[PDB]
């Protein structure tokens, strides 16, 4: 019944200002305290903020103290995080958490119970650019034991996340998208394959359908068989 | 602050095994410690509460145990949507996570099927050029891409991913990318990249010549 | 007169 979810995730240069909400459902908000935690890339997940149930009390990592400020209105069921002179090392998914919530008041320290989707936060100089995509066309070099591949390349896009779909048939062996490398430019890039039948190679046509929201582009690109 | 720390940090079992997750605290907490489920994209999902109690929404297949310093959890027997990421949390005094412990699934030895694509034209015209060698469907995760640019060993100039175990056949895929720049795309004649796997009878390669 | 950050903030 616990409903949360998070907004206000984006895009931020280093040392700027940013304000996350959490609005919040099934549950009588003002009598449950609520957290703020983060998943950071390379890192795992780290607390950041706890806020009593009507704001009287506040606690707050170390790593953020000073910067980040965690507020909350009953009246209107939302959480607040305000972050302020950001870097690069605050780049995480932030999820707003309830406190753990016991109806009896058995125990004497508490932790957390149910976690909200959470809203991706990217603290970075690069700006948001959209994917060149270039066909992974397929060829005898493409081809492994009655397997032929073939892909799209979704190379320097920023920020996450894109996603890639095709046109498969009935035979289509699977269908990988790669989880996204950084580049030294701090750009992203990826690529999305499709395995298909061998025989399938100059019978078809296939098209992958490139999706970046943050940049608010689509590109169709088609993979056409190569003669080597 | 108090460190917790997981074993094993990964572990590979059968959909039916038991598997146990053992978290241990830098100092003594009671039993003032949770455990979460995660899944790649999901929420976190709490699953036993003060060490050893379960939360009435999740399956009594799962049981937790221990307290001061040491910590158990344990999956009777494992279904096929239990293969995730475990986090043990103390809240005795702020709130610390251990580092995860993934369950991934076992299955037989499967050979990469292996795969290499020239750049495109249309890359070469703006400047670069992307080769990728492509390794689908193999199992254990152990793999080796070696890419050779005229029979030279390439090093620093390779970008690898693999993406999660496969929710159907339980393997893993891996792309291997190297990127030069026209100019020196075109100072070089054969394109290579040899892959190892134990599943493969002998070290496969596949290799283009510039401009075939 | 503030309560520890890990007592019961309901």
Known sequence: ?228 | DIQMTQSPSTLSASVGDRVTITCRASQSISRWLAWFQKKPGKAPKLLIYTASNLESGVPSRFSGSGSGTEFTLTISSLQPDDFATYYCQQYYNYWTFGQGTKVEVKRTVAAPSVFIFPPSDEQLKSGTASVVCLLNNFYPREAKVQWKVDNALQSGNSQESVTEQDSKDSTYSLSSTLTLSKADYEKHKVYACEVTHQGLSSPVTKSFNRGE | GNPDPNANPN
């Not at chain 1, 240069?13 to 003002?30: E, H, I, K």
């Not at chain 1, 009598?31 to 997940?45: A, E, F, I, Y």
């Not at chain 1, 066309?137 to 493409?142: G, L, M």
């Not at chain 1, 190379?155 to 046109?167: A, G, L, R």
């Open chain 1, 1 to 228: 019944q616990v409903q949360l979810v998070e907004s206000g995730g984006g895009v931020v240069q280093p040392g700027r200002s940013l304000r996350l909400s959490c609005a919040a459902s099934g549950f009588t908000f003002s009598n449950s305290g609520m957290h703020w935690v983060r998943q950071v890339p390379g890192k795992g997940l780290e607390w950041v903020a706890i806020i009593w149930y009507d704001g009287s009390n506040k606690y707050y990592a170390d790593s953020v103290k000073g910067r980040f400020s965690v507020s909350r209105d009953n009246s209107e069921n939302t959480l607040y995080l305000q972050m302020s002179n950001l870097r690069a090392e605050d780049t995480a998914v932030y999820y707003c958490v309830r406190a753990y919530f016991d109806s009896e008041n058995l125990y004497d320290y508490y932790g957390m119970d149910v976690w909200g989707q959470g809203t991706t936060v990217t603290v970075s100089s690069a700006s948001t650019k959209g994917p060149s995509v270039f066909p992974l066309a397929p060829s005898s070099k493409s081809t492994s034991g009655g397997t032929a591949a073939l892909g799209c390349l979704v190379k320097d896009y920023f920020p996450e996340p894109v996603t890639v779909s095709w046109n498969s048939g009935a035979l289509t062996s699977g269908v990988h998208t790669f989880p996204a490398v950084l580049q030294s430019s701090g750009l992203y890039s990826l690529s999305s394959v499709v395995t298909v039948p061998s025989s399938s190679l100059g019978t078809q046509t296939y098209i992958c359908n490139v999706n970046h929201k943050p940049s608010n582009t689509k590109v169709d690109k088609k993979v056409e068989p190569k003669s080597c």
